[PDB]
Design a protein around this ligand. Structure first.
Ligand code: ZN
Lengths: 58, 476, 98, 108, 97, 106, 264, 49, 92, 45, 69
């Protein structure tokens, strides 16, 4: 991929290996980025104690 | 923008109903007010004054007290008008349920929704029904509807007519005013008739005292709803100001001066035409209301109903379009010269039905020899009048003294007027337009912001020139 | 040239070299050019706004929340009220049984 | 403070100057612990607006030995348990044994 | 949670395109059911933006090189005029807006 | 006599605009402006964004999923009312600023 | 999540030799170790699933060119590629062959498949009227096409025509300026707009399937709406309704002859 | 006993004639402030006559 | 203060405090009303396995409605007191 | 440039630094190694 | 004069938010502590949430047994 990508920057192939990987963040048990992209559909808030027409209190 | 508004230069009536009956019963005492052939009643303004002040006293004795309700299942009668007058003089909320369909189940409902102190109903109700795909009248024995609803009346023991609660199911119900025309000389004995004649007091007719306390903006009517805005608005409540002006608006545009024999097709005492727009027009601005044949659904009396408007010299007839095919199907039998006394016809279109296309009105004038045909369009909230469009000059100015702005849902009194192409909430304003609506929970109202606009809870989209088209509630 | 925060003193040392960056010298000179009638060529303070901005005289949300939350409860009591006289009828002929 | 679910960012207070008591102390730069003062004297909202921090160094500036970059021994006012007594205490920073390799002098 | 408005002038590191990115009004987490961690780190964090993004990585998308990175140097608006006033009228069309 | 030129005046508090400044019952000085220029929404606003200075989307409808599922649940949490599509917060601050005349003359 | 069977303990020798509550049981740094380690061992068994968060989103219509949906997109990427179309375009379809005979046919399908991947799904996420879908046909069709519909029910075709010399890294950019051109041109050449102003303001969200890895945007749905929040500094609306002063319009310049001079 | 609303006995409470005629929709403290503004007009109508 | 439980006149029995002796007769018409009612000895003892019911003026509706018994502590209009929609025998 | 004072305040900073530094992870070509050729269900065996 | 018409009163189906028998009910000022502010659902709970505070002022709602309070 980087061959064709280096011609997109108009630069040399070796130069792009420092624009598409500015550092090689290897991965460990101790240093994982979040394993599961957090939930997109969050549960819907509700009036407090299942009160229904809105809620007077918090 | 998404705002339309009618001129203001027209005068607005405001007092009670029972007041405009007075100063018509003085200025025009002997002048006919309503004539009918199916009951032979030639009523002068003298009559309805005397026949309502003597009927309101006729309900005070029979228990009706001001706040209470009272139910009416009357088919297209005259005595279903003096009910409104009486129920206005005592503030009792008259409720007019459509008889064109009834059963013990629909009655086990109004008795529970309205909870009427009184139930005004007949023994025989002319209910239409389709035989071999064709409409034919079936005399319905309404008596069997009551006794199924009230199994207490059959189980009679020598104390029950003085029992406290006549039917422990419906403790609301105290009397059932039967209204059946009867031909025997000796009428019913005072055990079963309410005294409706004479000076019911000594020192002051105690109506004009109670007529001081109720306000021109509290209910006198509850007209059932054909298509409800949403599950709540089971009935629409009209006050004094809402009905009386719903006539003097119409009574203004048709310029019904005195000596005006204008008719109303029957089967309309349910929807606002026969209840508010027709009679109270004949009342405020001196006129004559000539009802036509007892009903108008089947073809056999549409031929008859025309001869009724041939001798009674009628000058215009109001009524929904479903009434004007029966006149149309049999405008061929009668010669053209039978509508020479006619001048115009009025078609009250509901806000949602369809634009009655100017081709169809061309059929009517081509059959009835009319100068013009008027089409009053609007929801039942606005008493069937926001845009009136004649046939010749189809230009439809909003009725005078009305507004209608479509606003966005967020605010109420600040909800900003929309951009005249988009569906938002609808806000009506004017004398005739009501804001209250009955319901199972009881009398209820809808928002009246601090600018006079009463939410109607019917999302609508206003277009270029005075053209308000309703829509259904969005459910995304 | 922006408004320095509160924690910074408000001091215009006067018209000096690069005075136009002193936010208080700028908007004070900009004001004497009014009383003098000099024509302020440069632009005015552009108060920036968002996509989701609301006007000042906004449309309030509480008086529509409570005018709504009652319809919810009157659309519900309306439903839960069907056959109530029939229902409570058998409430007694069962309590009168016990 | 507003009550809607999704409050997209905006230029100004959308619904007027933010209501509530704690929004009253944030509207003036104070931190939200001003909500728990019994007396808010003109010195108090000076004391707690952190104009100049009540926070010092363990030894003199001249005799200082362990490299305290930008720190003081800030006192943390705690309120006690069930019966709320207010007491304060001086919280230090965490000094680690910095055993580095400065390659200038080629030795740890 | 920034009660007050403030617009920074972020200078990219890839193209040095001085673009400005503001900070609107994001309301305080509710005090009615208070939460001590989410508040006292909302506030302490607010001084760290108010002091020109002191202890935060700045993550905004450039306007010149259309991409989102973390390379912005937050310019105090008199280091910006130091830069803006000192660019030939053409490069103001290149690096500024 | 201390303001040599007209130093622009800010409109009053929202609570004042509700009751006096824009209310024709007092002939408030904005009762002309309010009806003329303010009470009309933006020429692009739909039904949901009738209150934004400019409609924040190219379409009235909810923008993303969490603005939708929130409004897909709300419009049924409140029984299906006409305008209940617009999500509203289920908690009354009981503030005096958000208080306008709930009952009164007109 | 299938990796939640973390052993409620850990090898680490308990500091605090003496005794007490809380000893020898897992720590939230160790609970993330085993979560990652036993995540990899599934990711070798291939049983590990990434539609564990995207459970409510309607699972997209599977199709052989429609792999663009099943990809978990980085929210910081769908922010870069901010493409917008004229609102009255209801959908976009990009069909292309599987195997392309002519050398210039493989060029275009590369562009299509590229634009099938690069530019189509951002348009969905950003515009949310359009129903972006791509399908890989199966034959030696040396030319792919694009069916840009519109709200009025009309539609066009956009014959995907890249130049021989150009790359595909711009062949799509051409196609992009060949679609977003049409979309406005179609939306400008629409009939009466009152109807499409209703459907558009009725069209439900089409981009529900889209799987966006909200990365460092997980704080509150405030920043999940960060691509809709659109700062607009120097906003301009210079059209005031000026209300001039009719009564006593003069009389400001005619008073206080200051300190009347020698004549008076 | 253990009721809350004993039947209307002789007490000069709110306008019960108009407590019946009014929409139950409105809350209380906004109704007793609105049966008066109804009555306040019914007092003017009566004085004018 | 200590002295949390008083000792002068510890009353033998005490009607208000008994497993379900005080009951909130909340209204079946889900208007949120309630009318606290102590079950008399006719129901103090478990004469009623059925949950008590009564007809009482519902001051909100201004109508006599049912009053089903229920514990006096709790929100009286929960998402359980919503009635399933139904089309009435009225309307077209 | 900024130290994180909480693990989940770090595991966001890992997400920022995973984008700027190791950017090839977030290309339209690396999100589709799975699909540079035939959807696997149509290939030989 | 102008024949313009307006109703006599505005009926809003809104319900009062101050019930005389409910404790924290009322319309509070725009800078009073909103209903149960800092309380977090517990009786005098804003005291229990004080130890949770990061750092308090030097004069912060300390011990004060209601003696001649
Ligand atoms: Zn850049």
């Amino acid at each position: 991929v980087l061959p064709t990508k280096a011609q997109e920057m108009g630069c040399t192939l070796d130069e792009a290996r420092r624009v598409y990987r500015q550092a090689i963040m290897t991965e460990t048990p101790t240093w994982h980025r979040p394993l599961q992209c957090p939930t997109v559909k969050q549960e819907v808030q509700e009036p407090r104690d299942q009160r229904w027409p809105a809620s007077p209190k918090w | 923008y998404s705002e339309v508004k009618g001129t203001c230069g027209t005068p607005v009536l405001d007092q009670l109903i029972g007041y405009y009956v007075n100063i018509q019963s003085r200025k025009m005492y002997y002048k006919d007010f309503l004539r009918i052939e199916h009951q032979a009643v030639r009523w002068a303004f003298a009559d309805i004054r005397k026949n309502s002040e003597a009927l309101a006293h006729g309900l005070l004795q029979t228990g009706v007290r001001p706040g209470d309700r009272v139910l009416a299942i009357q088919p297209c009668n005259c005595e279903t008008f003096v009910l409104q007058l009486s129920c206005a003089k005592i503030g009792a909320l008259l409720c007019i349920v459509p008889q064109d369909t009834i059963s013990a189940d629909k009655l086990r409902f109004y008795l529970n929704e309205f909870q009427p102190r009184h139930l005004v109903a007949r023994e025989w109700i002319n209910v239409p029904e389709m035989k071999q795909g064709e409409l034919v009248e079936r005399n319905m024995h309404f008596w069997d509807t009551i006794y199924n609803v009230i199994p207490e009346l059959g189980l009679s023991y020598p104390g029950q007519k003085f029992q406290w609660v006549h039917s422990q199911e419906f403790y609301y119900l105290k009397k059932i005013i039967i209204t059946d025309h009867n031909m025997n000389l000796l009428g019913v004995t005072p055990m079963r008739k309410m005294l409706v004649w004479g000076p019911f007091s000594y020192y002051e007719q105690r109506l004009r005292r109670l007529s001081a306390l109720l306000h021109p903006d509290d209910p006198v009517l509850a007209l059932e709803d054909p298509n409800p805005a949403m599950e709540d608005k089971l009935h629409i409540t009209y006050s004094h100001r809402n009905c009386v002006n719903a006539g003097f608006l119409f009574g203004q545009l048709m310029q019904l001066k005195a000596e005006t024999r204008f008719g109303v097709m029957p089967n309309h005492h349910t929807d606002p035409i026969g209840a508010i727009i027709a009679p109270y027009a004949a009342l405020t601005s001196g006129a004559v209301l000539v009802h036509i044949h007892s009903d108008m659904f089947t073809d056999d009396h549409a031929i008859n109903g025309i001869e009724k408007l041939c001798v009674e010299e009628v000058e215009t007839l109001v009524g929904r379009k479903a009434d004007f095919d029966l006149i149309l199907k049999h405008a061929g039998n009668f010669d053209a010269d039978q509508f020479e006394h006619l001048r115009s016809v009025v078609i009250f279109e509901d806000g949602i039905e369809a634009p009655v296309s100017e081709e169809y009105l061309n059929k009517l004038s081509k059959a009835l020899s009319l100068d013009d045909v008027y089409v009053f369009r609007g929801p039942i909230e606005a008493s069937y009048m926001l845009t009136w469009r004649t046939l010749k000059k189809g230009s439809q100015g909003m009725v005078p003294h009305v507004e209608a702005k479509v606003v966005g849902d967020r605010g109420t009194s600040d909800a900003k007027v929309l951009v005249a192409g988009t569906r938002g909430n609808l806000r009506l304003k004017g004398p005739h337009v009501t804001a209250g609506y009955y319901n199972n929970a009881g009398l209820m109202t809808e928002l009246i912001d601090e600018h006079g606009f009463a939410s109607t809870s019917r999302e609508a989209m206003i277009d270029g020139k005075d053209n308000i088209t309703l829509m259904s509630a969005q459910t995304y | 040239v922006p408004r320095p925060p509160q924690r910074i003193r408000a001091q215009s040392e006067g018209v000096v070299g690069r005075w136009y960056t002193n936010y208080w010298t700028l908007h004070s000179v900009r004001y004497q050019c009014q009383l003098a009638g000099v024509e302020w060529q440069f632009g005015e303070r552009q108060r920036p706004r968002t996509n989701y901005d609301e006007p000042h005289m906004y449309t309030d949300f509480e008086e529509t929340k409570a005018i709504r939350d009652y319809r919810s409860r009157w659309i519900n009591v309306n439903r839960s009220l069907v056959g109530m006289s029939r229902r409570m009828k058998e409430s007694e002929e069962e309590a009168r049984y016990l | 403070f507003s009550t809607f679910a999704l409050n997209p960012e905006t230029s100004r207070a959308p619904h007027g100057p933010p209501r509530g008591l704690i929004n009253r102390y944030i509207s003036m730069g104070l931190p939200p612990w001003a909500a728990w003062c019994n007396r808010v004297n003109r010195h108090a909202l000076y004391r707690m607006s952190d104009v100049s921090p009540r926070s010092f160094l363990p030894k003199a500036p001249h005799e200082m030995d362990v490299i305290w970059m930008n720190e003081r021994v800030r006192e943390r006012v705690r309120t006690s348990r069930q019966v709320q007594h207010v007491y304060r205490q001086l919280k230090y920073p965490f000094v680690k044994t910095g055993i580095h390799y400065s390659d200038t002098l080629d030795h740890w | 949670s920034n009660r007050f408005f403030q617009k920074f002038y972020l200078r990219c590191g890839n193209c040095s395109a001085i673009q400005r990115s503001a900070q609107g009004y994001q309301p305080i987490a509710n005090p009615i059911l208070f939460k001590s961690d989410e508040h006292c780190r909302n506030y302490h964090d607010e001084q760290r933006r108010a002091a020109g993004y002191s202890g935060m990585v700045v993550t905004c998308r450039c306007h010149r090189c259309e991409r989102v990175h973390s390379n912005w140097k937050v310019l105090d608006a008199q280091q910006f005029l130091d830069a803006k006033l000192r660019m030939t009228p053409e490069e103001r069309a290149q690096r500024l807006w | 006599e201390e303001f040599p030129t007209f130093m622009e005046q800010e409109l009053p508090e929202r609570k004042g605009l509700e009751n006096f400044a824009t209310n024709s019952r007092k002939r408030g000085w904005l009762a002309q402006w309010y009806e003329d220029e303010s009470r009309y929404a933006h020429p692009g606003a739909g039904r949901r964004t009738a209150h934004y200075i400019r409609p924040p989307t190219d379409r009235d409808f909810p923008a993303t999923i969490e603005e939708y599922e929130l409004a897909k649940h709300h419009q049924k949490w409140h029984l299906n009312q006409p305008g209940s599509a617009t999500v509203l917060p289920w908690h009354s601050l009981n503030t005096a600023d958000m208080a306008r005349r709930s009952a009164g003359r007109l | 999540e299938q990796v939640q069977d973390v052993p409620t303990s850990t090898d680490r020798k308990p500091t605090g030799m003496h005794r007490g509550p809380g000893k020898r049981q897992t720590a939230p740094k160790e609970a993330a170790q085993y979560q990652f380690i036993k995540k990899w061992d599934l990711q070798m068994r291939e049983t590990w699933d990434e539609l564990e968060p995207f459970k409510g989103l309607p699972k997209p219509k599977v199709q052989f060119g429609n792999e663009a949906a099943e990809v978990i997109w980085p929210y910081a990427l769908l922010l870069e590629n901010v493409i917008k179309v004229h609102p009255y375009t209801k959908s976009i379809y990009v069909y292309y062959s599987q195997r392309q005979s002519t050398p210039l046919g493989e060029l275009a399908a590369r562009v299509a498949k590229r634009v099938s991947q690069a530019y189509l799904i951002p348009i969905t996420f950003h515009n949310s009227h359009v129903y972006v879908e791509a399908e890989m046909l199966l034959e030696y069709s040396e030319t792919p096409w694009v069916v840009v519909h519109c709200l009025d029910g009309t539609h066009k075709l956009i014959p995907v025509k890249p130049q021989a010399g150009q790359t595909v890294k711009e062949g799509a950019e051409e196609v992009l300026n060949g679609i977003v051109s049409a979309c406005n041109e179609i939306g400008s050449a629409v009939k009466n707009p009152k109807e499409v102003m209703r459907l558009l303001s009725e069209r439900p969200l089409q981009n529900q399937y889209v799987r966006v890895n909200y990365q460092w945007y997980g704080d509150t749905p405030e920043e999940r709406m960060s691509h809709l929040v659109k700062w607009d500094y120097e906003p301009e609306e210079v059209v005031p309704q000026l209300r001039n002063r009719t009564q006593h319009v003069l009389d400001w310049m005619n008073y206080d002859g200051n300190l009347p001079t020698h004549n008076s | 006993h253990h009721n809350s609303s004993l039947p209307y006995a002789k007490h000069d409470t709110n306008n019960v004639l108009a407590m019946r005629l009014f929409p139950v929709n409105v809350g209380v403290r906004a109704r007793t402030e609105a049966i008066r503004i109804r009555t306040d007009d019914c007092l003017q109508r009566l004085r004018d006559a | 203060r200590l002295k949390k439980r008083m000792v002068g006149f510890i009353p033998k029995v005490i009607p208000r405090k008994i497993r379900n002796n005080m009951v909130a007769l909340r209204s079946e018409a889900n208007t949120g009303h309630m009318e606290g009612y102590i079950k008399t000895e006719a129901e103090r003892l478990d004469a009623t396995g059925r949950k008590l019911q009564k007809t009482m003026w519902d001051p909100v509706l201004q109508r006599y409605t049912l009053m089903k018994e229920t514990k006096v502590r709790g929100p009286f209009l929960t998402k359980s007191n919503i009635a399933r929609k139904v089309d009435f025998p009225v309307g077209a | 440039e900024e130290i994180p004072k909480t693990p989940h305040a770090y595991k966001k900073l890992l997400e920022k630094q995973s984008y700027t530094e190791e950017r090839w992870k977030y290309t339209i070509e690396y999100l589709f190694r799975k699909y540079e050729a035939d959807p696997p269900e149509l290939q030989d065996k | 004069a102008s024949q313009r018409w307006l109703p006599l009163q505005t009926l809003k189906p809104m319900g009062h938010n101050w019930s005389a028998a409910t404790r924290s009910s009322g319309v509070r000022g725009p800078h009073m502590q909103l209903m149960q502010e800092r309380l977090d659902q517990k009786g005098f709970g804003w005291k229990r949430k004080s130890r949770s505070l990061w750092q308090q002022d030097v004069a912060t709602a300390g011990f004060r047994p209601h003696r001649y309070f």
